[PDB]
Paper text:
To understand the molecular basis for crRNA processing and target interference by [name]-11, we determined a cryo-electron microscopy (cryo-EM) structure of [name] [name]-11 (DiCas7-11) at an overall resolution of 2.82 Å. The wild-type DiCas7-11 was incubated with its precursor crRNA (pre-crRNA) and a complementary target RNA under a reactive condition before being made frozen specimen. Under this condition, DiCas7-11 successfully processes the pre-crRNA and cleaves the target RNA. The density map resolves most of the DiCas7-11 protein, the crRNA (–15 to +19) and the partially cleaved target RNA (+19* to +2*). The core [name]-11 assembly is half-moon shaped with four [name]-like (C7L) domains (C7L.1–C7L.4 from N- to the C-terminus) forming a long ridge and a single Cas11-like domain (C11L) occupying the crescent center. The 34-nt crRNA lies along the C7L ridge with its repeat region spanning C7L.1-C7L.2 and the spacer region covering C7L.3-C7L.4. The first 18 nucleotides of the target RNA (+19* to +2*) remain base paired with the spacer region of the crRNA. The observed structure suggests that the pre-crRNA is processed by the first C7L domain, which yields a mature crRNA containing the last 15 nucleotides of the direct repeat (5’-tag) linked to the programmed spacer. A well-conserved histidine residue, His43, is immediately next to the leaving 5’-hydroxyl oxygen (2.3 Å) of U(–15), suggesting its role in processing. Two acidic residues, Asp429 and Asp654, were previously shown to be critical to cleavage at site 1 and site 2, respectively.
Residue numbers in the entry: 1 to 133, 142 to 238, 257 to 366, 382 to 978, 1296 to 1315, 1330 to 1601
RNA sequence: UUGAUGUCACGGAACACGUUCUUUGAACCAAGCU
RNA sequence: AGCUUGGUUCAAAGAACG
């Protein structure tokens, strides 16, 4: 009597499943339950077992069929086959106890009254509705749909992952609230099966109505569908426990966070395990990758060997399997590192019936959404915790572009067109505003990418404005999808008006011009797509012929029918009636930097082959399916520097300098850059370099103030991008500014003043600007006709005032031609170190302080050695490969050059000037290896205990930055900075003003830009036991080691030893260098800011000395090398953002103010000043003091001078050694 | 695994807000031993 | 008392969210 119809619904996109509900909570008052009534249900065994399987109720399929029937009946005027249909009853007002009621209006196709209840006959629509006049057999019964075969799964997480969906405010730009739903991918569970039992009494017209309605229902359970009718993951955890043991067995545990983040960095990197940084030699002993070897213990295997074995486990050879290994392994190491809203409907009564436009055109726009920038789509996994900001991925690990986001962006874009937001709330009858009306005829197909590589991790920090450094707890990372990912776009509009609505045409035209800001993190230039290859064709559903094959083809919704429909679509997009300009304008930036640049990324260097401590940031492009790296300045960093430039200028208001909470603020910074509640109107993109600049490595060593030698464990390097005045690094990007800001006169001035400051070199880009990195030569914003760019036109009053002459030197040194002087002496510091006064922050430009640039002219007196240690094999007479990997070859070096230009690194000049500044102001030994324990054949006390606590480095022990040392910061820690406080002076690279003059003529006469080698004597580390004669408590640290000036380099140039006079021989322990002669002129520029009157004076007095002194620079200082002179050429002071002025006339006041502080500091107890002056005293006239180190024994010195064995018991015995080493130019004879 | 004369949930952008940055001369002569 | 011979440092201190 009843026939069963086989129906299978297949989902074309991920569908949504409501979560399991208890029968108690399945009531009508459950907001979460009723919200999920349109979603698939999860059948779960009752008590405590989430094991079960999903299903779709037949009631949901029935209601979806009813809607299609109304739409089909409206399109046919109710004339199905040959008989009419009434509008239906839709009342059931007997009790109204039925979840739930129909809020939307019912479509009206006829004015006839509904069929009377209990009538002997019913129209086809009433037969479909199930109206009736165990005998209650359904006229048409819809059975539930289940997975084929009724499988069983562990729980809802086995099939789908819960996702959070938010509602973003239109004006604020930030989300009011959110709701979560299970998303079950259609690629794993595409098809459902069910039954529709039809009684034999059902009319053929009702059967035709049911079949047509089934072929019309295109969306069920939140997805586009077509209804038809007729031991495994344990490897990554065993490796994790092995690593934690190996780290534990070797102490460590501080590298786990770097190892967790670096191993996870190998997620894309099955082939990257083979290429790892390795040690400084080729020995293969890395401080991170070779932790567990422990001097060749059989039970010990290094972390490198652990991963190499994992790289070839016979199952991780697949890319996907390997990727989940690193994620699981990295996420496991991370855990060890740490350890050690549902809108509701309203029960409104009988819904009004509306005779909507029976024309009902159908429009399909097919295209590709192409990522012009990196994008970011939400979706934080509640299990994964090694990343703070994750991206939405499919279970296949493909990048997903949800229709929930695309629906929201179209809704947001439609509102901007109309200039009217939509204030309708969730619940009640549908909103009838222009935006909601267009969005109810819109269908957007959910999309995924063919590209499958893992996301990049970007590390973002919040900088403390006052301290100039990273704030406490401001390090966080995010997953970023690459540029160039193309998503297949499917837009489908259905409405009465022919073609797309007028607003929809413009928003699609906005998107076509690369102005689709689809994803989140838009402030940092993430999520700008362009709709490409758009096509469209309208379908007239009212036409019987066109509507008939529409049902037969299932609307061409499935992948089989799309290409057939795609042939009909014509290329392009309809021209909007009244096109409106998009609300965002693109400003093209062009920055030029005449210095090296580094935008740091520690994790990428932990995995890089070069092994450098710091490397520059690189992003990836989705070049098809394989990603390619590219060096770029981070958009997050560029926004941060530009935001800082604006904020430090402005005092809004009365008179904080834009450093407020911004909780309830109407701030120039808040409403240009955005707040936590007020998403900004400026969108910075990544900045990329014009050419392909290959990174270079620069070695850095922190010298000890006491021993003058390298401080242990503080030898480092980094791989910045090379730049210079010969080859500036042209950085080219964009930022997007909204209409309401670019048309605002004050914002153009606020941005223009800041961009002028950046133009004036006031804001270096990236990190390590203290040593001359990322100095901006210029900055052009040549988009944006006039407006902002008009303020980037500085005027410098170039009144030619000569810089004051250097004062004559008071220092008097008497040198005898028959004595021999020790190569170095110690300037004993004053007992008082002025630790006051809690230095000024970097958050403003304080009144009274001075900011500007000091142009200096350094000149060499003795030959100068500044080596390029990147190539210690420079001077080798061919046969290079013969001693490669020998580990004992003679080391050779060339002078530092950047892009084939002789230069002095700012780090070199910075320490050389810093050392003199520290002694002049009696500051602490900024670098001092305190932990070293002296042995006298052993001390019971540390070396740092010898000196006073005042001389101790200031860093040594939110408010920890200024509370780290109770006493505070010494004068040179204020100026040159600490780890916790950023320095106020930046030392640029010094460039050779003229063609070089070399100490030794070059081997090839053709090239005058290279010099010959000079072989130095052996250079050995300093012995503090000589300075501190014994373990006696009386003996203390003598003071700052300084190397006197002398001409022992003349003996070395001839090849003779400085002391014995015997010719030096090549050995595996002495160096060969290229040294400039005397007379080479270098210009370098010192940028400072917020300098006091005296600090700028002491700096000048430290930079330029008195007439008759000199500086010591480079290596071989004890051999008379690297005597240099600095003359301050010009002082330019930043009066304001637009006007700069000269201080060439104000120089003598700075020197006077500086010395007055010296007199106040020490009250004419300045013996260290004169002692330093004697040490700095260059030998004037014809006098040639003989300076050298004693030999071990007198018999080893052909000149007859005694040796260390004789001196050790002679005049330098035990108690005359401290006094004879702290007195400059005292001879040991 | 749902009831049935009423399901706009394609009715809802995981959105907004953060500079991998701060400091550090590639430098350096007297001990080691029974 | 016995004569002469030897390279060192290769990252560190922080920040891992308000
Ligand atoms: Zn009827
Ligand atoms: Zn609305
Ligand atoms: Zn503000
Ligand atoms: Zn200090």
């Amino acid at each position: 009597m009843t026939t069963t119809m086989k129906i299978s619904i297949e989902f074309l996109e991920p569908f949504r499943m409501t979560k399991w509900q208890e029968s108690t909570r399945r009531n009508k008052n459950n907001k979460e339950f009723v919200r999920g009534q349109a979603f698939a249900r999860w059948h779960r065994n009752k008590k405590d077992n989430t094991k079960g399987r999903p299903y779709i109720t037949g009631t949901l399929l029935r209601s979806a069929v009813i809607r299609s029937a109304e739409n089909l009946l409206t399109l046919s005027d109710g004339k199905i086959s040959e008989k009419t249909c009434c509008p239906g009853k839709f009342d059931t007002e007997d009790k109204d106890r039925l979840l739930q009621l129909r809020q939307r209006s019912t479509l009206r196709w006829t004015d006839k009254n509904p069929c009377p209840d209990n009538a002997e006959t019913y129209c086809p629509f009433c037969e479909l509705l199930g109206r009736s006049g165990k005998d209650w057999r359904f006229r048409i019964h819809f059975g539930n749909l289940s997975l084929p075969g009724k499988p069983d799964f562990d729980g809802p997480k086995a099939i789908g992952s819960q996702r959070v969906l938010n509602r973003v405010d239109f004006k604020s730009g930030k989300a009011h609230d959110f709701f979560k739903a299970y998303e079950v991918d259609h690629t794993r569970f595409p098809r459902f099966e069910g039954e529709i039992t039809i009684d034999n009494k059902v009319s053929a017209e009702a059967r035709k109505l049911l079949c047509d309605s089934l072929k019309f229902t295109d969306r069920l359970c939140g997805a586009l569908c077509v209804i038809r009718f007729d031991p495994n993951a344990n490897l990554a955890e065993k490796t994790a426990e092995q690593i934690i043991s190996i780290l534990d067995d070797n102490k460590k545990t501080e590298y786990t966070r770097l190892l967790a983040d670096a191993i996870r960095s190998l997620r894309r990197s099955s082939k990257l395990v083979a290429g790892l940084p390795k040690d400084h030699d080729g020995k293969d002993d890395h401080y991170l990758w070779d932790i567990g070897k422990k001097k060749k213990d059989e039970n010990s295997v290094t972390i490198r060997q652990i991963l190499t074995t994992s790289a070839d486990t016979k199952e991780l050879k697949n890319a996907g399997k390997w990727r989940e290994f690193c994620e699981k392994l990295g996420e496991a190491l991370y855990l060890k590192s740490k350890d050690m809203f549902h809108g509701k409907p309203d029960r409104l009564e009988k819904s009004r019936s509306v005779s909507i436009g029976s024309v009902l055109k159908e429009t399909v726009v097919c295209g590709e959404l192409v990522a012009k920038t990196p994008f970011f789509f939400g979706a934080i996994d509640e299990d994964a915790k090694q990343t703070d900001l994750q991206v939405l991925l499919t279970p296949d690990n493909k990048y997903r572009l949800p229709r929930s986001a695309v629906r929201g962006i179209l809704r947001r874009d439609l509102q901007t067109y109309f200039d009217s937001p939509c204030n309708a709330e969730l619940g009640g009858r549908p909103c009838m505003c222009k935006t909601c009306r267009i969005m109810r005829g819109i269908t957007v197909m959910d999309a995924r990418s063919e590209y499958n590589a893992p996301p990049e991790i970007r590390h973002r920090t919040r900088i403390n404005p006052f301290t100039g450094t990273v704030a406490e707890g401001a390090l966080f990372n995010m997953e970023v999808a690459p540029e160039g990912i193309v998503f297949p776009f499917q837009l489908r509009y259905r409405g009465s008006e022919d073609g797309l609505p007028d607003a929809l045409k413009t928003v699609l035209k906005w998107w076509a011009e690369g102005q689709a800001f689809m994803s989140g993190a838009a402030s940092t230039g993430k999520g700008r797509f362009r709709m490409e290859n758009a096509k469209y064709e309208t379908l007239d559903l009212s036409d019987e012929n066109q509507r008939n094959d529409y049902l037969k083809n299932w609307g061409w919704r499935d992948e089989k029918g799309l290409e057939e429909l795609k042939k009909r679509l014509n290329s392009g997009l309809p021209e909007p009636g009244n096109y409106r300009d998009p609300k965002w304008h693109e400003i093209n930036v062009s920055i030029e930097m005449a210095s090296p640049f580094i935008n740091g990324d520690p994790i990428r260097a932990a995995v890089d082959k070069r092994g450098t401590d710091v490397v520059t940031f690189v992003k990836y492009k989705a070049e098809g399916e394989e990603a390619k790296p590219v060096c770029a300045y981070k958009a997050e960093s560029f926004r941060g520097v530009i935001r800082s430039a604006v904020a430090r200028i402005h005092m809004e208001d009365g008179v904080p300098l834009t450093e407020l909470t911004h909780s309830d603020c109407e701030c120039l910074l808040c409403q240009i850059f955005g707040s936590e509640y007020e998403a900004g109107k400026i969108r910075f993109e990544d900045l990329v370099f014009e050419s392909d600049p290959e990174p270079v490595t620069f070695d850095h060593v922190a010298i000890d103030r006491f021993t003058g030698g390298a401080a242990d464990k503080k030898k480092f390097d980094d791989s910045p991008l090379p730049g210079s005045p010969a080859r500036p690094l042209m950085l080219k990007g964009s930022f997007w500014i909204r209409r309401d800001v670019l048309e605002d006169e004050e914002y153009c001035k606020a941005l223009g003043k800041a961009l002028a400051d950046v133009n004036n070199g006031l804001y270096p880009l990236g990190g390590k600007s203290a040593i001359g990195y990322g100095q901006v030569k210029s900055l052009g914003i040549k988009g944006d006709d006039k407006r902002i760019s008009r303020l980037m036109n500085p005027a410098f009053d170039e009144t030619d005032v000569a810089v004051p002459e250097k004062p004559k030197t008071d220092a008097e040194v008497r040198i005898e031609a028959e004595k021999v002087y020790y190569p170095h002496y110690f300037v004993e510091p004053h007992k008082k170190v002025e630790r006051e006064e809690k230095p000024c922050g970097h958050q403003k430009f304080h009144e009274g302080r001075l900011t500007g640039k000091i142009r200096c002219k350094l000149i060499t007196k003795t030959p100068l050695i500044v080596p390029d240690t990147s190539n210690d094999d420079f001077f080798r007479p061919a046969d290079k490969e013969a001693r490669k990997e020998k580990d004992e070859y003679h080391k050779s070096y060339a002078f530092f050059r950047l892009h084939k230009q002789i230069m002095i690194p700012g780090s070199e000049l910075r320490g050389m000037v810093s050392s003199v500044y520290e002694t002049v102001t009696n500051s602490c030994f900024r670098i001092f290896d305190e932990t070293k324990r002296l042995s006298w054949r052993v001390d019971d006390r540390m070396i740092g205990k010898r000196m006073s606590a005042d001389l101790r480095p200031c860093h040594g022990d939110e408010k920890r930055l200024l509370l780290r040392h109770p006493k505070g910061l010494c004068p040179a820690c204020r100026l040159f900075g600490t780890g916790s406080y950023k320095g106020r002076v930046r030392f640029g690279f010094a460039s050779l003003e003229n063609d070089p003059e070399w100490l030794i003529p070059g081997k090839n006469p053709g090239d005058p830009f290279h010099g010959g080698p000079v072989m130095l004597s052996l250079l050995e580390r300093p012995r503090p036991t000589w300075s501190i004669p014994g373990s006696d408590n009386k003996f203390k640290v003598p003071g700052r080691k300084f190397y006197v000036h002398h001409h022992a380099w003349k003996t070395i140039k001839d090849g003779n030893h400085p002391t014995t006079g015997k010719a030096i021989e090549q050995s595996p322990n002495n160096r060969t260098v290229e040294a400039l002669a005397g007379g080479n002129s270098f210009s370098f520029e010192i940028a400072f800011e917020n300098l006091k009157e005296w600090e700028l004076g002491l700096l000048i007095h430290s930079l330029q000395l008195e007439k008759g002194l000199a500086h010591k620079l480079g290596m071989a200082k004890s051999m008379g090398f690297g005597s240099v002179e600095i003359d301050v050429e010009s002082v330019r002071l930043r009066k304001d953002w637009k006007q700069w002025r000269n201080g060439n006339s104000e120089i003598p006041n700075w020197l006077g103010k500086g010395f007055a502080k010296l007199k106040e500091w020490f009250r004419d107890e300045l013996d260290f000043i004169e002692n330093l002056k004697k040490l700095l005293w260059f030998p004037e006239g014809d006098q040639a003091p003989r300076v050298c180190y004693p030999m071990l024994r007198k018999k080893d010195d052909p000149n007859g001078n005694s040796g260390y064995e004789e001196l050790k018991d002679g005049e330098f015995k035990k108690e005359d050694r401290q006094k004879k080493l702290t007195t400059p130019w005292t001879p040991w004879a």
